[PDB]
Design brief:
Bound molecules: copper (II) ion
Helix content: 10-25%
PDB class: electron transport
Distance between the termini: 18 Å
Number of helices: 2
Assembly: monomeric
Entry title: Three-dimensional structure of the mutant K109A of Paracoccus pantotrophus pseudoazurin at pH 7.0
Number of strands: 8
Number of domains: 1
Keywords: electron transport
Shape: globular
Name: pseudoazurin
Structural class: alpha/beta
Length: about 120
């Protein structure tokens, strides 16, 4: 249905952080991105995106909403704190076609650290 993601300087998970960092959703489902902390945004990791999905990037300190219809893995990052490891992951539907790629897509060490972490949450 609807899924709220907080964008945090600091959180229970760590520093520069999407909470929740992983989201299971289904077609039609809505992702509300929410500026709990200023200085963040949410851009698409295009080497983690189902084919047919439009690239996107949000204005800093402001809100954002993505709509999901296409199954698979949607990768997201915060543009200025990408290399600080601030990333998220949304899986829609069973056995995502872009699975291996998520695991293999080249990104900042810290981003990759947390990506694989939200990746082990896939079902
Ligand atoms: Cu950030």
């Amino acid at each position: 249905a609807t899924h709220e993601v907080h964008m945090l300087n600091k959180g229970e998970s760590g520093a520069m952080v999407f909470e929740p960092a992983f989201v299971r959703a289904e077609p039609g489902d809505v992702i509300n991105f929410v500026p709990t902390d200023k200085s963040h945004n949410v851009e698409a990791i295009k080497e983690i995106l189902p084919e047919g999905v439009e690239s996107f990037k949000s204005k800093i300190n402001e809100s954002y909403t993505l709509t999901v219809t296409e199954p698979g893995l949607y990768g997201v990052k915060c543009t200025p704190h990408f290399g600080m490891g601030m990333v998220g992951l949304v899986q829609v539907g069973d056995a995502p076609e872009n699975l291996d790629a998520a695991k293999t897509a080249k990104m900042p060490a810290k981003a990759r650290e947390r990506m694989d972490a939200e990746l082990a949450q896939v079902n």
